[PDB]
RNA sequence: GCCGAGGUAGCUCAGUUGGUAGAGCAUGCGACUGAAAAUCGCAGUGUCCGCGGUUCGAUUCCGCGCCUCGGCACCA
């Protein structure tokens, strides 16, 4: 039970903590960093016609 | 429906072969799913006569002494094994299909068993294996090979469409083959009745459920097994013989599609009462199944004095208790027409599907009961040596079919054929109609059994088929369509072109189930579906999609998991649901991007898509621009709405990071407009042949401002003579204030008739600088 | 005389007679897809251009030309595609241009041709100087093109008297050679006072590959990288 | 609406004297490269369908309902 305990007491606390920790660390950099002027001209692919 | 060739050939004597019959039934309106030979019985199986059945002490087995030409014994654990019946004796050295290893002399519990007495499964005539076959003890001379009296049969598997319940009876089916010119042989129920009173009374209490209900009376019955021809016939049709009486009921049923059932009078009481089950009442049907009854079930009950008990689930399946057995001498024969809906309901309510209900659901001859009673009563008299009574017990007086106005002129008009009147009237008369007519429009009244003939169009169909659809000639109609039909196909050619155009640029088309996972409503942050299902293939497919991307994206994940597309530009046009069904176009970009297979320099992401998209509507000659808008499913940093020809119709951005993270997906971009796209009529406009005065000019602007507002303003005040515009560079650098950026535009002016003087352009380039100031922008 | 409409089944040797047509049409439509602007150009040819673009003189000439400039019948589509360019850049100054033309050429036999033409800054970002263009931009579209048609495509350097020796090869559709792809010979651009330019001119009808469906395996694809040191002169 | 079988790591899936929840490409840092790859340790995104149990990490007894299938009864 010492392990039955620690095996649970650790896996859940640890593995998930680190996750959600970065789940809110990485997903945080983007949200802030990535800011574009959407209404800005984009790549100039050609446009045909007949 | 299983159709035993030879059984049919008994009514239709001159049939060519199982093959031709299928060709024939084909043109008649019935296709055969399969054909198959059925009773391969080795020379090793003979008929034998159970002289005596001796119980082997200590066992549950029996030593049978059989007259198999000479005398032999056999051991058998079959309950039904008794003295005085015939059996299918498989002699030692016989190869049985149903049990493959070679039968032989074997000692069992002390007796030299000389081969074994077969069972339905063991002979290969039926799936039953809980007893031996039971032949009439005098069936054949002891020892004669069984095949000699049980030839290989051929069974066709016919699809019988709902408009032909008359066809769930071979004699009915036969009537169609007749119309093609085949001789028809109807059995002549040869009754020898006796004018005497019936020991029971009828009391139909729900004439609504039993529109027509007749009871027969056969007594002094001698129950025994059926002759071989009967047993053989029933088996080929997918049914298992059970005796004298019970078998004739099933035989007739299959023959003329009229379910019937012999109730044993010992149980009938005073009389038979056709009523509804008293909410509560219990009944144990033939299948051994003990059931409870919903007060809506139409029951066939009996009453005794002041009592009333159920005897059978009317039209569906008889009751276990009153079934006829060997010790029965008199019966009450049920032959009725039951309300199709009542049966349907009940049948399913109890999860039952019988040959009986199946027919009563589809439809029974409203006036074919009585003829049926005689056919059964006759046969009972001939195989059970019964003494049939003379009077029946009727309840209900159905009205024969009405006349149908039939003009062979129209038949030929509607078919594009020119069948001579004569052939038509002739045919109709072969199918049993009464053609009381003089011409040109006859009074055709069909046979009580044709439920599928009410209209004059129904009749014309009868000619085409009996005459052969292959006789209707080919043709092509020529006419000018009514005016409100001109251009009705614009909406279509429009969208189609669309797809075609997309497929041009580089988009890969994709179709995705209209279904939506209610969960994705949260998973992609959308509003829950308004239209859901009451019977989803799976909760995952429980609702109706409100967007096209959730799917476009999912098909992506699914791709990257089976294969790992390095990149992917996709699109889908489909119907979305929400308040109203509406067509949508969806796109999706993802991966490295567009560039050089080598040189790391790639061109991609948001602006790559807006790239194609601008390039897209460019092709369609339609106004397009994006204007940042919050969309619960797109990176707040890259998310706006799409504006086609000025009107908003969708969105364009990158999938919300938090989301990609859940579906464990990389970054991704998309858009989803709504169709049909705006329609700009074209106004040609001669382009001036006079040089376009063009000048550059940067505009220092605050970092938060969107390029959209800038240009909108420049072009606006830039004057009419302004030809082009363009943004050749965006600079957010050193020689500029804090939180600022410069937009350098490449303008270009031009006059229609003559060249322009720089004094004019300035008076314009200026007007652009003035409003650029009145607003709040600089001008490097 | 009243109005009417005839109704009949056409004789059998008339079934599908319009394939050749729907084929080419689709073609144009597909090109117009990617981004090519269609262009029609007089079938006439200036005998001089025979030398001006280094081509063989015309076999079919005229006995009554509208003007010596329009004295012969064109043997190629580009001389014109290019000329309509010069003429553009002179009336207006297109910053760039991707063009195409489908027309009848004459020489030994009349034959349909497809011609293209790229020119200008290239494809990129209206701002960010980083542009994607030139020879490989065109081969870009073209590979993208036959990609759409589901047809084999590759170039193999070949000398063509009208293309930069440095950038000039033939085009191979489904294995069979049918034209060329490269940049206009510098010496030429210089005469028509034109910047650098790229083009190609295949011959129609393009090969016809019947499709053979092929279930793709649902079992993971073992994939590995590996460089190959090769001598600079060797072609990829 | 009955017998019977399967439903487990970007994927394909065996399994059961259990230390193996994994093997086969594939995938995550050092470091061999400019940029990779064949590499050596170092490791597991895995609710082994969902709600509840099960040993020291459970897949399996075991409960009912779900994605999958054969047959069956219908008939696309
Ligand atoms: Mg009909």
3-state helix, strand, coil in chain A (%, to 5): 60, 0, 40
- A44 contact C CB<8A: yes
- What is the dihedral sign for C-alpha C221, C224, C225, C227? negative
Structure tokens at C53: 């673009």
* Residue pair B85/B137 in contact by the 8 Å Cβ criterion: yes
CATH of B401-474, one of 1.10.3720.10, 3.40.50.450, 3.30.565.10, 3.30.56.10: 3.30.56.10
At C173 the three-state DSSP class reads strand
User: Residue B595's beta-bridge partner residues?
Assistant: B602
- Strand B669-674 versus strand B647-655 pairing type: antiparallel
Q: Which among C191, C134, C140, C137 has a CA at the least distance from the CA of C162?
A: C191
Q: Ligand 1 centroid vs B338 CA: distance in angstroms?
A: 22
d(CA B522, CA C75): 64
DSSP C36: P
Widest Cα–Cα separation across chain C: 81
Q: Where in chain B is the domain with CATH 2.40.50.140?
A: 38-153
d(CA B233, CA B517): 53
How close does chain B come to A38, measured CA to CA in Å?
A: 6
Whether residues B474 and C9 touch (CB distance < 8 A) is answered with: yes
Whether residues B637 and A44 touch (CB distance < 8 A) is answered with: no
Of B608, B637, B706, the CB nearest to A42: B608
At B308 the three-state DSSP class reads strand
Distance in Å from D14's C1' to C220's CA comes to: 17
d(CA B708, CA B775): 14
Q: Which CATH class is domain B489-679?
A: alpha beta
| Nucleotides, chain D, CB distance < 7 Å | 1, 10-12, 24-26, 34-38, 45-46, 55-57, 66-68, 73-75
Of A44, A48, A49, the CB nearest to C126: A44
At C184 the three-state DSSP class reads strand
Q: What is the dihedral of CA C130, C136, C141, C145, to 10 degrees?
A: -160
Query: What CATH fold (topology level) applies to the domain B690-780?
Result: Alpha-Beta Plaits (3.30.70)
Whether residues C35 and B501 touch (CB distance < 8 A) is answered with: no
Partners of chain C (3+ Cβ pairs below 8 A): A, B
* Residue pair B256/B375 in contact by the 8 Å Cβ criterion: yes
Residue C230 has, within 13 A of its CA and on its CB side, a CA count of 8
Q: For the purposes of burial, counting CB atoms within 10 Å of the CB of B235, is it exposed (0-12), middle (13-18) or buried (19 or more)?
A: buried
CATH of B187-400, one of 3.40.50.300, 3.50.40.10, 3.40.190.10, 1.20.1260.10: 3.50.40.10
d(CA C85, CA C163): 17
Contact pairs from chain A to chain C, CB under 8 Å: 38
DSSP string, B312-333: EETTTEEBTTT---TT---EEE
d(CA C198, CA C182): 6
At B473 the three-state DSSP class reads coil
d(CA B749, CA B465): 77
Residue A22's closest chain B neighbor by CA?
B661
Q: Annotated binding residue at B627? A: no
- Strand B748-749 versus strand B722-724 pairing type: antiparallel
Residue C129's closest chain A neighbor by CA?
A43
Chain C residues within 8 A of B500 when measuring between CB atoms? 29, 33
Phi/psi of residue B728, each to 5°? -90, 0
At B541 the three-state DSSP class reads helix
- The footprint of strand D (CB < 7 Å) covers A 1, 3-4, 7-8, 15; B 31, 33, 159, 238, 351, 353, 358, 537-540, 558, 561-562, 564, 664; C 218-227
Q: Where in chain B is the domain with CATH 3.30.70.380?
A: 690-780
- A39 contact C CB<8A: no
Nucleotide nearest to A3 (CA to C1'): D56
Q: Please name the residue ranges forming H helices in chain C.
A: 19-34, 49-52, 78-91, 135-149, 186-191
Discontinuities in chain A with C to N beyond 2.5 Å fall right after none
Burial B99-134 (b: 16+ CB within 10 A, else e): beeebeeeebeebebbbbbbbbbbbbbbeeeeebbb
Nucleotide nearest to C228 (CA to C1'): D37
How close does chain B come to C92, measured CA to CA in Å?
A: 7
Q: Annotated binding residue at B462? A: yes
d(CA B128, CA B594): 70
Structure tokens at C25: 């049409």
Q: What is the dihedral of CA B442, B443, B446, B447, to 10 degrees?
A: -120
Q: Which among B268, B320, B267, B265 has a CA at the least distance from the CA of B291?
A: B320
Burial C176-201 (b: 16+ CB within 10 A, else e): eebbbbbbbbeebbeebebebbbbbb
Structure tokens at B210: 């039993």
- Strand C123-124 versus strand B508-509 pairing type: unpaired
Element spanning B25, H or E: helix B18-28
Q: Which residue has the tokens 């000619």?
A: B463
Q: For the purposes of burial, counting CB atoms within 10 Å of the CB of B458, is it exposed (0-12), middle (13-18) or buried (19 or more)?
A: middle
Q: Return the number of other C-beta atoms located less than 10 Å from residue B561's C-beta.
A: 9
B64 CB-near residues (< 8 Å, 6+ apart): B50, B52, B53, B54, B73, B74, B75, B76, B81, B87, B117
B1-37+154-186 is classed CATH 3.40.50.12780:
no
CATH, domain range B38-153:
2.40.50.140
Structure tokens at B772: 């650029």
B527 CB-near residues (< 8 Å, 6+ apart): B521, B546, B578
How close does chain A come to B690, measured CA to CA in Å?
A: 25
Distance in Å from D71's C1' to B127's CA comes to: 13
Q: Annotated binding residue at B561? A: no
Q: Which residue has the tokens 């020529």?
A: B478
User: Determination method here?
Assistant: X-ray
Of C4, C91, C136, the CB nearest to B596: C136
CATH of C18-208, one of 3.30.930.10, 3.30.830.10, 1.20.1090.10, 3.90.1150.10: 3.30.930.10
Tell me whether the omega of the peptide bond preceding residue B716 falls within 30 degrees of 0, making it cis.
no
Q: Annotated binding residue at B679? A: no
| CA dist A37 → A41, B610, B638, C124 (Å) | 9, 12, 7, 17
């Amino acid at each position: 039970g010492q392990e039955l305990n620690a095996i649970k007491a650790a896996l859940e606390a640890a593995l998930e903590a680190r996750e959600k920790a970065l789940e809110e660390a990485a997903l945080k950099e983007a949200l802030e960093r990535e800011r574009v002027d959407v209404s800005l001209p984009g790549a100039s692919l050609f446009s045909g016609g007949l | 429906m299983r159709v035993p060739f030879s059984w049919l050939k008994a009514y239709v004597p001159e049939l060519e072969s199982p093959e031709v019959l299928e060709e024939r039934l084909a043109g008649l309106g019935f296709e055969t799913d399969r054909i198959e030979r059925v009773f391969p019985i080795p020379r090793g199986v003979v008929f034998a006569r159970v002289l005596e059945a001796h119980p082997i002490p200590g066992t549950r087995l029996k030593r049978l002494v059989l007259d198999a030409g000479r005398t032999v014994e056999v051991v058998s654990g079959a309950e039904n094994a008794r003295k005085g019946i015939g059996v299918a004796l498989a002699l030692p050295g016989t190869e049985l299909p149903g049990l493959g290893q070679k039968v032989g002399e074997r000692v069992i519990q002390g007796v030299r068993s000389f081969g074994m007495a077969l069972s339905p499964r063991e002979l290969g005539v039926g799936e039953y294996g809980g007893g031996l076959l039971e032949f009439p003890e005098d069936a054949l001379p002891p020892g004669t090979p069984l095949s000699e009296a049980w030839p290989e049969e051929v069974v066709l598997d016919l699809e019988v469409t709902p408009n032909r319940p008359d066809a769930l009876g071979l004699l009915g089916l036969a009537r169609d083959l007749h119309a093609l010119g085949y001789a028809l042989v109807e059995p002549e129920a040869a009754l020898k009745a006796e004018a005497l009173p019936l020991p029971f009374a009828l009391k139909v209490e729900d004439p609504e459920g039993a529109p027509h209900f007749t009871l027969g009376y056969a007594f002094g019955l001698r129950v025994a097994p059926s002759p071989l021809w009967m047993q053989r016939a029933l088996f080929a049709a997918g049914m298992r013989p059970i005796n004298n009486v019970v078998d004739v009921t099933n035989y007739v049923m299959l023959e003329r599609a009229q379910p019937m059932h012999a109730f044993d009078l010992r149980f009938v009481g005073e009389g038979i009462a056709v009523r509804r089950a008293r909410e509560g009442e219990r009944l144990k049907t033939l299948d051994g199944v003990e059931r409870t009854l919903h007060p809506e079930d139409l029951v066939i009950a009996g009453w005794r004095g002041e009592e009333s008990f159920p005897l059978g689930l009317a039209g569906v399946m008889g009751g276990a208790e009153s079934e006829v057995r060997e010790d029965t001498e008199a019966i009450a024969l049920e032959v009725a027409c039951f309300d199709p809906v009542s049966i349907r309901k009940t049948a399913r309510r109890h999860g039952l599907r019988t040959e009986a209900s199946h027919r009563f659901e589809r439809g029974v001859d409203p006036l074919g009961q009585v003829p049926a009673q005689r056919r059964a009563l006759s046969l009972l008299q001939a195989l059970a040596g019964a003494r049939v009574a003379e009077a029946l017990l009727e309840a209900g007086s159905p009205k024969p079919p009405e006349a149908i106005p039939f003009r062979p002129e129209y038949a030929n008009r509607l078919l594009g054929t020119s069948y001579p009147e004569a052939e038509q009237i002739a045919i109709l008369k072969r199918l049993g109609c009464r053609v009381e007519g003089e011409g040109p429009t006859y009074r055709v009244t069909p046979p009580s059994h044709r439920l599928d003939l009410r209209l004059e169009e129904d009749l014309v169909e009868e000619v085409a088929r009996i005459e052969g659809y292959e006789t209707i000639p080919l043709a092509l109609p020529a006419f000018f369509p009514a005016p409100d039909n001109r251009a009705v196909e614009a909406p279509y050619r429009k969208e189609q072109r669309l797809r075609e155009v997309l497929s041009g640029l580089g988009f890969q088309e994709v179709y995705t189930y209209s279904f939506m996972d209610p969960e994705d409503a949260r998973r992609f942050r959308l509003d829950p579906p308004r239209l859901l299902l009451l019977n989803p293939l799976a909760p995952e497919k429980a609702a109706l999609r409100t967007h096209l991307f959730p799917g476009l994206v999912r098909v992506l994940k699914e791709n990257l998991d089976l294969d790992r597309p390095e990149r992917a530009l996709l699109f889908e046009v489909g119907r979305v649901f929400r308040e109203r069904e509406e067509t949508h176009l969806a796109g999706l970009l993802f991966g490295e991007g567009v560039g050089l297979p080598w040189a790391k320099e790639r061109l991609s992401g948001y602006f790559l898509l807006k790239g194609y998209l601008e390039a897209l509507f460019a092709r369609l000659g339609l106004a397009f621009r994006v204007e940042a808008e919050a969309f619960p499913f797109l990176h707040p940093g890259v998310s706006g709405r799409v504006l086609v020809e000025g009107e908003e119709v969708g969105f364009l951005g990158a999938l919300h990071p938090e989301i990609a993270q859940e579906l464990e997906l990389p970054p991704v971009h998309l858009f989803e407009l709504r169709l049909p796209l705006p329609d700009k009529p074209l106004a040609f406009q001669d382009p001036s042949r006079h040089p376009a005065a063009f000048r550059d000019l940067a505009v220092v602007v605050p970092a938060p401002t969107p390029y959209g507002e800038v240009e909108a303003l420049v072009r606006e005040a830039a004057g009419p003579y302004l030809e082009s515009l363009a943004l050749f560079d965006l600079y957010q650098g050193p020689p500029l204030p804090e939180g600022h950026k410069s937009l350098a535009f490449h303008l270009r002016f031009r006059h229609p008739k003559r060249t322009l003087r720089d004094e004019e352009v300035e008076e314009a380039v200026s007007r652009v600088a003035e409003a650029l100031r009145a607003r709040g922008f600089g001008l490097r």
